[PDB]
Amino acid sequence: ILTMLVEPDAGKATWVAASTYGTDTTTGEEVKGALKEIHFSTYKLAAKSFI
């Protein structure tokens, strides 16, 4: 197998308000993502001939 990592999709960054400004919420929502994987493997083709 050959597994590669596919980067995860975009997640929005929150629009904080004015009350939030000056508080821990000012920093806004966390944007969090997990890499995903795609896997490649092999099959077989074979043939025989016989003189």
Next chain:
Amino acid sequence: SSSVEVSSESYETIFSQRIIRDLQKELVVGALFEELPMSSK
């Protein structure tokens, strides 16, 4: 609210002095023609 620790009462807002017109009506008729510089009624 611009209210963290210390405050200013709207002194800050940049009152600005730039003016503008909404692509206002083109005038096309008034000037097209020519004038007969008349002297009376």
